[PDB]
């Protein structure tokens, strides 16, 4: 299998037998993508075990894969097992089972439903404030991934099930635990070298999702379903949709995938944002000023005031450019095709190296720097929406994007209304990224929180 | 997985864990199909390991699967590994790779090409006669599977490569051996219980085709290709087609599958025919008379005289009804569908129990008896072409049917022109079928050959 890219005349590193190029992952997906872009140029290939991965960087080519030829050729992401019943999760389903779930859950993430979810997301920003203030009156450095992880979990439970917990002070509630539990850890590298073992593990009901987590949430949902039936969150929006319609095991899968999609992403991004704010105190100050110009007297943000804050949107987008937590985007080529002059054989995984593209000098001036002005209403027109893809692009992009941006912004407004964030001596400057398989700091971000009082 | 047919309300035997119903194969596919038709009626289900197989017997339903919904829903047969490069063999390829090979090789089996192949198939009938006459002048019972196996091989080599051998007297020629080498033998039952092992064996290049056979024929073809290039058989018909076009490894796969398709089928059917002729000497006598009425003075049969013999066609079809060497027909349901009022879930293998249908009293009077008159020009109109399916039906039926019928008939004319076949004391009467996984006699058919001289 290791003669395909050599046969198509596509450059790339030379693969060892069995392993492919996976030894190149010793410095992380992102460093390997960067080195590969620099070495081989616009298009290259490599092998995840025996799996040919063809990396592309042409905006027209990226556009054709993610948007134009989605329903026909590039419909699925690369397979993932063992998954068990999570096969029905939208992000894992394939072909016509996805296209059906994508429709049942699309009206769940409309602007109308999202503005309604704002008051509930607003109540736990206040919870975050009081909890941050307890840590601000003491004088001890704050770990963001904990205080934000507690907040991100607070929004999920309330916006997906109506379960109302202060998870930071209730870290030992049974509903809070099922969730805090890396494609370069020993198991998945083994899966990439021995993918012939996935069908073994699937017949043994061994699931990459912990079987106790999914067993707890499955019965926890069926309790909520028959307590409301009969006597604003995602579950209620999915129950109303099954009233082709959403099944009862399908509905529990999506609820899990919503948490598993929304938890460490929301938490880890606010951490990258607050890091950048504290190491560029000017940007934090201007953001604090725009916040107080729109919401004077520490006013509670609303849906419309959040869309009014332009410098806030710039800080978010610039952070996501720096740290695009997907790192990559991937589609499985289900048929032989020629797009933009390049023949792609069936079965190849086409990959768009997001992190690398977001840091390419040929598209960004001083790409390593934190310059929110790249996205000002003046310059935001010069950015190719296929070079900047933090939520991906096309019919299979992030279905929760609007919710994510609105969630993270409501947090930042309330937190910056009341506090200022200054680096510590133990704050890692410059921040270094984890050489693992997840986009995250090598050491958790720790900052000093002060009160505007 | 073992709750599907119970959920759809479809009757059938109860499956043990892991095994499914495979213990019911202890008396052969055919006895199990018969018992199942009698017990459960028109539609039933069972499990090959974990694989749901839904058996159908409604002619309209059979018609929809094999003909109407072929290109959309029921395009492939149930998977088969480990196969290696024989994935490209027409009978194994899937979806759009099959539909392309089916077209490249369809004009190879036209009536025009087949009438041209008749003189070459005629030369080795004479070889068979002299060889049978050597065994007729002695006085020793003749094993048909050897004398016919030698003949069937003779037609293949000459009609597929131009290789001209008297295989019966040259049993030790290297080209003759690569070919004489059961889905109920230990390996394939293991594959049916542990199908998660096929991807293991495929990455070990272990192939159900012997790797020495395919390595011999691969290089043997590339010798013929460049000796004709540049300086009437199947290879030449496939070389002219690649002049989307047929590849060089694709072309060797089909050549193998033509032998492997045409060898034990042609050989074993003539054996079933000569058995029935010898145990019904009246039918053999009438067939001998029709043969001599069309070809007087032991004339050499031609293409048109073969299509003129009506009682010969009746003997063939009635034998194939009795012994339909496919036993079953199978299609993999690639999408959820409802046909003829029955919902079929995606992935289920739909199976048509040919052998059972060919022996159903509700469609055949005295079905166990050898009555060639069922197919006379009077009664041949009352036979549902979906109840009688010796070559299957629809766009994925036997591509070599015309060649097979013409091949077996030319053999029978020449053999019956010169000899008469009478049972032995060691001839198994009534013939008993192998309880294994292939349709064949439990003991090889042995008959006494006499000369009309
Ligand atoms: C900062 C927050 C987030 C970022 C940066 C992000 C990014 C992404 C990206 C890049 C993709 C793949 C898009 C593609 O393949 O082109 C994706 C998919 C997805 N996201 Fe997110 N995401 C975020 C938050 C969320 C949230 C809060 C949810 C809540 C439900 C969510 C649900 C999903 C789902 C279901 C998919 C799979 C979509 C599909 O396969 O149809 N995401 N996200
Ligand atoms: C008495 C002789 C034969 C009988 C009874 C027979 C019967 C069958 C049957 C029942 C099928 C499956 C049809 C279906 O799925 O509906 C089949 C397929 C096939 N046969 Fe035969 N066959 C015979 C001889 C031959 C010969 C001589 C060849 C020579 C090339 C051949 C080539 C094929 C191929 C390639 C397929 C697969 C077709 C496809 O998948 O497109 N067969 N045969
Ligand atoms: C690794 C491999 C090459 C084999 O398969 C990919 O190609 N890797 C995608 C699968 S990881 C997986 C992680 C996970 C699974 C189940 C439950 C929770 C997490 C996954 O399916 N999560 C789906 C959506 C979760 C999500 C996370 C972040 C943002 N939004 C949604 C990685 C992947 C798939 C789909 C969307 C993604 C979005 C961002 C980052 C990775 C995403
Ligand atoms: C057993 C399983 C349920 C997993 O898979 C089926 O469903 N079993 C079909 C595969 S057996 C296989 C045997 C074979 C393979 C490779 C080389 C030679 C023989 C096969 O692929 N041979 C394809 C065509 C050969 C042929 C034989 C007889 C007549 N014409 C053609 C069985 C099967 C598939 C396709 C056509 C068949 C025709 C008659 C009988 C069986 C046929």
UniProtKB/Swiss-Prot annotation, chains A, B:
Outcome (variant: residue 329 to F): In allele CYP3A4*12; has an altered testosterone hydroxylase activity
Effect after changing residue 134 to Q: In allele CYP3A4*15
Consequence of changing residue 146 to H: In allele CYP3A4*10
Needed cofactors: heme
Subunit structure: Interacts with PGRMC1; the interaction requires PGRMC1 homodimerization.
Record annotation: effect of changing residue 157 to S: In allele CYP3A4*16
Membrane topology, from the record: Single-pass membrane protein
Protein name: Cytochrome P450 3A4
Binding site for heme: 398
Pathway per the UniProt entry: Steroid hormone biosynthesis; Cofactor metabolism; retinol metabolism; Steroid metabolism; cholesterol metabolism; Lipid metabolism; fatty acid metabolism
PROSITE patterns assigned: CYTOCHROME_P450 (PS00086)
GO CC terms, sorted: cytoplasm; endoplasmic reticulum membrane; intracellular membrane-bounded organelle
Disease listed for this protein: Vitamin D-dependent rickets 3: An autosomal dominant disorder of vitamin D metabolism resulting in early-onset rickets, reduced serum levels of the vitamin D metabolites 25-hydroxyvitamin D and 1,25-dihydroxyvitamin D, and deficient responsiveness to parent and activated forms of vitamin D.
Family: Belongs to the cytochrome P450 family.
Outcome of mutating residue 90 to V: In allele CYP3A4*4; significant decrease in catalytic efficiency
EC class of the enzyme, as a word: oxidoreductase
Subcellular location: Endoplasmic reticulum membrane; Microsome membrane
Reported induction: By drugs, such as rifampicin.
GO molecular function: 1,8-cineole 2-exo-monooxygenase activity; 1-alpha,25-dihydroxyvitamin D3 23-hydroxylase activity; anandamide 11,12 epoxidase activity; anandamide 14,15 epoxidase activity; anandamide 8,9 epoxidase activity; caffeine oxidase activity; enzyme binding; estrogen 16-alpha-hydroxylase activity
Result when mutating residue 102 to Q: In allele CYP3A4*8
Cross-referenced Pfam families: p450
Outcome of mutating residue 372 to L: In allele CYP3A4*13; lack of expression
EC number: 1.14.14.1, 1.14.14.56, 1.14.14.73, 1.14.14.55
Source species: Homo sapiens
Tissues showing expression: Expressed in prostate and liver. According to some authors, it is not expressed in brain. According to others, weak levels of expression are measured in some brain locations. Also expressed in epithelium of the small intestine and large intestine, bile duct, nasal mucosa, kidney, adrenal cortex, epithelium of the gastric mucosa with intestinal metaplasia, gallbladder, intercalated ducts of the pancreas, chief cells of the parathyroid and the corpus luteum of the ovary (at protein level).
